[model samples]
Target: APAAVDWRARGAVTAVKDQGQCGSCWAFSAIGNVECQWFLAGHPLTNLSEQMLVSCDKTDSGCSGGLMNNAFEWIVQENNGAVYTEDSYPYASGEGISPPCTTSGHTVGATITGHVELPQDEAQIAAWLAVNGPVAVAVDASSWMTYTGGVMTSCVSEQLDHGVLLVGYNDSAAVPYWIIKNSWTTQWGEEGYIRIAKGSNQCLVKEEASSAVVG
Candidate 1:
């Protein structure tokens, strides 16, 4: 295993985004994973549209709630593996009002042939991310509302109500942490990110780790 990995440091990760009142974290998580996977596959770092999944993915309910796996499935199976650019199908459900699915003028930003669900283990997740790219993770962010900074050693881990991206890990750190890209804007946690105590599965970081697949 390598000492540490940070996709953001390599310019594969995109800027942090805000999901607003919409329960669209799943969309952001899946899209963020795709963006990194696509970039690592020798493409430019493009900002794919979370709104594309929010409105277009029939398997996942927009704004209400959804899963990252469901979003990946919709793109690969239902949408012909095509993800649209954010500028074309810009997000409009920040207010929690997801509109009807539309397939209008939009350019293809990225594509994925499939996805992979990793084992429920942080070590394996970290290994996969170091070799592949960012992973979409479902976590219990119940205690996130009050988080300011620093690695989280204690968090409500019972409910996996939030979806985030696991960009990298730093096992060499004194605390040994997993770096996460959140969708609540830069004002939150380490500038739209979080580092959980890695080895103990803090915040349930190992429970539902997954990634989008690309060539």
Candidate 2:
């Protein structure tokens, strides 16, 4: 395994996006994972629709938070593995109110075969990430209300209330860390990203992790 990896630099990651006033981080989290997987699978990097999940997936609570794995399941099993492009379906829940699920056809951007949950072990996650691209993860983001920058070493590990993407890591730094991409916009925490200490399960990052499999 490589000592460090950043898909952002490798062009597998799309630009940091904003979730606005919606509790749709789960959609963003899962979509971010798919974006990378599709790129690594030989497609150009593209922005898929988070609104496609927030408004379409019946299993998830729109604008009221959802689970990343459920989003993945809904896409593969319910939606026939199709995700619409962002510009086509667009994001309409930015004001905290989700629109009704639109039946109108939106262009499909990417397709996934399935998804797999990674083991809840940081070392294993790091090793897999070193070769497999980014992984989607849930985190205890209650402490992120006041976060600024740098490697965050202190945070609670109790509640996994927020969904985010694990884009990269640095095992060689003074404090080994997992590089995470959040949806709060580029103005927040290192241009819409954060790094917490790796092995100690900071913010319970190792608790629930998974990714979509693109083909």
Clashes of each: 0, 0
- In candidate 1, list every pair of residues with a backbone clash: none
Q: Model 2 Cα displacement at 72 (Å)? A: 0.8
lDDT of 1 by residue, 5-88 (tens): 998999999999989899999999999999999999999999999999998888988898999998888888889899999998
Candidate 1: stretches off by over 4 Å = none
On the 0 to 100 scale, the lDDT of residue 27 in model 2 is 95
TM-score of every candidate: 0.98, 0.98
Candidate 2: tens digits of C-alpha lDDT, residues 87-155: 889999989989998866789999998999999999999888889899999999999988899999999
Q: Supply candidate 2's per-residue lDDT for 105.
A: 74
Q: Identify the runs in model 2 with alpha carbons over 4 angstroms from their true place.
A: none
Residue range with the least summed lDDT across 10 consecutive positions in model 2? 100-109
Best by lDDT: 2
Model 1 is weakest, by summed lDDT over 10 consecutive residues, at 121-130
The positional error of residue 96 in candidate 1, measured at the CA in angstroms, is 0.7
